[model samples]
Target: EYAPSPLDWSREQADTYMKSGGTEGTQLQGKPVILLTTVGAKTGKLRKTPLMRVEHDGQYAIVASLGGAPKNPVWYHNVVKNPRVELQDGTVTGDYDAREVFGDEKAIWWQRAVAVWPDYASYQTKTDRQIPVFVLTPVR
Candidate 1:
């Protein structure tokens, strides 16, 4: 139930991260990074993607900034259709449910996200749509 991302760079990043057991390919712009494994909503294929590390308390949050793209990334839809996903942070991996958040709850996570990657703040201004945020809480 695992597959490398179709995109070359993303696939390589994920592969490098996993092959090294969370050693290599774990940093972006001198900050930590994480990977999310999601099932495609339409293709039903497992896809691995590298995301900026953003965790609060004990949960993780993912921002759909897409580098300020006009539209959401395809993976965003896959995780929406199937909120369950696998996250790898450093050498730790776990099952989590992706919960899209909004309003006040989103603001909390949003601040945490920006703390990890300030570019997220600028990404918002690049697009007309507000970037979506998702909190990935561990499965209990």
Candidate 2:
């Protein structure tokens, strides 16, 4: 299951902002995106992860598509232990709860996931581990 990690905002707000959305201050190649704030499972600190903006309705999906790395990213476990998180899409900010999706649900989102990032499909082929996917449902 995908996990939420604490956000380490002090690292560099510039990197945070660019990676959060993109170069255009909310556009990646002139497209929209969402920024996630996760907590570090061990350090008990915060970490920020920029993800493709594959959203549905008012909820968004956080894909653990670490280039389909061999090992699960550390943040994956962090969110599993702590599911509550915050999401920023452009200027809009809100609290969200993350939940891992599987089976057919994953299939549907996977299509959408790759649509947002086609390279992710190649990432899967580059590694052995199956990339994880989580749905971030708004809390309020």
Candidate 3:
């Protein structure tokens, strides 16, 4: 059963993964990912989003690729406003803060992003916007 997502558009793979215990289709492409369930900053409603799971040490990275779009996705703002987020990785769940990575740290994660999805490099070439990357570090 598919539940209504807060995002304006639904990525079919993401939707299916969320619906079927994260095992329905080619969702996440077998790579690890998590549903970043957030509360709308203004609407005060729950919003769930699936993103590529990039982990280092114990924290997870949230890449704002938007397929290399010119602008960041709305969820980016939602997460920033409400740093406290619930991450559902497969079946594991935990709370985390969405921290924007900058300086050398951002460069390191950006390299990791390209490693996971090589197309990210190509995506960068397609647009002028600097892709954003956030690290979701576990809180307690």
Report the number of clashing residue pairs per model: 0, 14, 0
Answer with 1 or 3, whichever has the higher lDDT.
Answer: 1
lDDT of 3: 0.77
What is the C-alpha lDDT profile of model 1 across 50-125, one tens digit per residue?
9999997879999987788899988999899999999999899999999999999999999998888998999998
Q: Which model is ahead, 1 or 2, in terms of TM-score?
A: 1
TM-scores for all predictions? 0.92, 0.80, 0.82
Using lDDT as the measure, name the better of candidate 2 and candidate 3.
Answer: 3
In terms of lDDT, the poorest run of 10 residues in model 3 is: 22-31
TM-score top scorer = 1
Regions of candidate 1 where Cα sits further than 4 Å from its true position? 1-7
Ranked by lDDT, the better of candidates 1 and 2 is 1
Q: What is the C-alpha lDDT of each candidate?
A: 0.90, 0.75, 0.77
Q: Which digits, one per residue and each the tens of the lDDT, describe model 3 over residues 2-44?
A: 9756353446655775778655533355566667888898898
Q: After superposition, how far is residue 49 of candidate 3 from its true place, in Å?
A: 0.9
- Runs in model 3 with CA error above 4 Å? 1-15, 23-26
Error of 1 at 80 (Å): 0.5
Which candidate's lDDT is highest?
1
C-alpha RMSD in Å of predicted model 1 compared with the true structure: 4.8
Cα RMSDs of all predictions?
A: 4.8, 6.7, 4.4
